[PDB]
């Protein structure tokens, strides 16, 4: 019971922010995560990516 | 100094005492009825022992 | 003041222990009653949780009993004779539980005479003649035979009692702590107990 309930709710949260696919969703793919995917989900990155800026330096301001 | 209010309290003082005695009467009365009814069951147990000896013998 | 602590004094290995706290009030000690024979003097001591303990000094009466024939009458307590706890108390006439004392022995005779309708051992036949023969024979007649006949073929009374009875003395055993109860009470000796303490007495003194 510990492995099921924990893993399910862990992976749910990784999917909810979208640093992980649901075409993955196994505990092994947690380990395939890396630094850059987190940093992509940051607000200033998403401002730049999907809204008006001229550089990343603009977007933070 | 006694006033009418005083005298009421002295009548009520004894009314309660008498009432208390009357309640211990009726409770024990009902309990005796109930107790004596069951002690059917007592009779039944004795009857059962006698019956068992006869029944066992019955061949 | 005087303590009743368990945290003074050694432990098993001969080690010592030391205090860590001052004497608590659930450990208490108030000196012995040392009650004697004399007129009733009682002091009331309040104790823990409330409650009263009567401490009696100079008792003179106890409710003894002769439970073989089931009479218990109030009788005077004359003197101590033997105390197995200590010898010194006997010399100084101090009363505590499980002493051996002397009593008046009077009401027991009155009880016997009235119930079994037969006298005790007597000094002489002229002893009873003025009074104590006018209540030993009575106008009832009307249970001269009907009552008395079953009292004429039961009761022996034991020898060791009877020789003392004449003197007006009987040997009874204090049962109750007088210092806590505020009363002396007891039972009168019989049988092998009465043989035992006779021998202890006779060994030690006359």
């Amino acid at each position: 019971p510990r492995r099921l309930f924990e893993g399910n709710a862990l992976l749910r949260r990784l999917v909810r922010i979208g640093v992980l696919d649901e075409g993955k969703m196994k505990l092994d793919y947690i380990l395939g995560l890396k630094i850059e995917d987190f940093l992509e989900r940051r607000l200033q990155t998403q401002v730049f990516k999907l809204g008006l800026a001229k550089s990343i330096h603009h977007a933070r301001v | 100094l006694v006033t009418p209010r005083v005298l009421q309290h002295k009548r009520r003082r004894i009314a309660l005492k008498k009432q208390r005695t009357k309640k211990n009467k009726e409770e024990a009365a009902e309990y005796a009825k109930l107790l004596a009814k069951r002690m059917k069951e007592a009779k039944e147990k004795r009857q059962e022992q006698i019956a068992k000896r006869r029944r066992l013998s019955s061949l | 003041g005087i303590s009743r602590d368990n945290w003074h004094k050694r432990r098993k290995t001969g080690g010592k222990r030391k205090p860590y706290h001052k004497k608590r009030k659930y450990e208490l000690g108030r000196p012995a009653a040392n009650t004697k024979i004399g007129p009733r003097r009682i002091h009331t001591v309040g104790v823990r949780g409330g409650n009263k303990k009567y401490r009696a000094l100079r008792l003179d009466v106890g409710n003894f009993s002769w439970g073989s024939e089931c009479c218990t009458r109030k009788t005077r307590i004359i003197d101590v004779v033997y105390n197995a706890s200590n010898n010194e108390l006997v010399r100084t006439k101090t009363l505590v539980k499980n002493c051996i004392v002397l009593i008046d022995s009077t009401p027991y005779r009155q009880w016997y005479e009235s119930h079994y309708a037969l006298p005790l051992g007597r000094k002489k036949g002229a002893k009873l003649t003025p009074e104590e023969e006018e209540i030993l024979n009575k106008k009832r007649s009307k249970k001269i035979q009907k009552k008395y006949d079953e009292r004429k073929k039961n009761a022996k009374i034991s020898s060791l009692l009877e020789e003392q009875f004449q003197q007006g003395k009987l040997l009874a055993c204090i049962a109750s702590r007088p210092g806590q109860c505020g009363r002396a009470d007891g039972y009168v000796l019989e049988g092998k107990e009465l043989e035992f303490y006779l021998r202890k007495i006779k060994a030690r003194k006359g």
């Binding site: 019971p1 099921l4 309930f5 709710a9 | 409770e27 024990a28 107790l35 069951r38 | -």
Partner: protein, 263 residues
């Protein structure tokens, strides 16, 4: 400090199942002395401003109790820290409402509203039989009531229905296998299931197996068992979930299945 009995109770050693916070001050209510055990109580004020939110401050609860709208077991109580516990009925007659104190499946006193019809009696465990002077018997219950002249066939670990007004029990159960029970103490709490078996030892406690109708077996000490009615036949109205008790995996699944957390 130990020259006498204490009177304060903190918040951070308070019995945890009253669901208190900790950013209000150091003290918590403290149950005052009464019929139920201190741990097993729910103080009055916690039902009235930390559950149903009639009041918002403790002074407000005092202002309710003073006007005497509150009853407990048909009598009037007027403290703010009256120690009501398991199997009592609260009765506010200025709303027409009646509550019952019973255990949730997660082991905490819930709100279980009921008919006025049910709210005229409660279930009381027998704990001791004691012959008083002049050959009279007695009962003693967990709500600490002494009911004189009981009929002799009632024994301990049985339960009796009591009429709040008059005493004088209406019915009773005699403890045995195949009777429906609720758990009231122990690490299991609020679970419902039939008795199934008992076990006896000579002194040093004894245990009592239980099994429910969902196929789970569990056990508890003897003195945490309480009878509620005949086999598969409750004589009380039960709060939702019915004492079955799910695991956390299944319980999660329900909320995301209906996809409901508001309505």
């Amino acid at each position: 400090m130990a020259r006498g009995p204490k009177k304060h109770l903190k918040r951070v050693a308070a019995p945890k199942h009253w669901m208190l916070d900790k950013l209000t001050s150091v003290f918590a209510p403290r149950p005052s002395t009464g019929p139920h055990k201190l741990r097993e109580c729910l103080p009055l004020i916690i039902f009235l401003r930390n559950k149903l939110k009639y009041a918002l401050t403790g002074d407000e609860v005092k202002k309710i109790c003073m006007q005497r709208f509150i009853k407990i077991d048909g009598k009037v109580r007027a403290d703010i820290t009256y120690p009501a516990g398991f199997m009592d009925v609260i009765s506010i007659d200025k709303t027409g409402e009646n509550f019952r104190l019973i255990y949730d499946t997660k082991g905490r006193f819930a709100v279980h509203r009921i008919t006025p019809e049910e709210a005229k009696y409660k279930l009381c465990k027998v704990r001791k039989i004691f012959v008083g002077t002049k050959g009279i018997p007695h009962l003693v219950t967990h709500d600490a009531r002494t009911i004189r002249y009981p009929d002799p066939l009632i024994k301990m670990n049985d339960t009796i229905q009591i009429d709040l007004e008059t005493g004088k029990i209406t019915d009773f159960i005699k403890f045995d296998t195949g009777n429906l029970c609720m758990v009231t103490g122990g690490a299991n709490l609020g679970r419902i299931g039939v008795i199934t078996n008992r076990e006896r030892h000579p002194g040093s406690f004894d245990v009592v197996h239980v099994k429910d109708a969902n196929g789970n077996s569990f056990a508890t000490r003897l003195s945490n068992i309480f009878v509620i009615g005949k086999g598969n036949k409750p004589w009380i109205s039960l709060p939702r979930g019915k004492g079955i008790r799910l695991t956390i995996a299944e319980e999660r699944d329900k909320r995301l299945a209906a996809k409901q957390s508001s309505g």
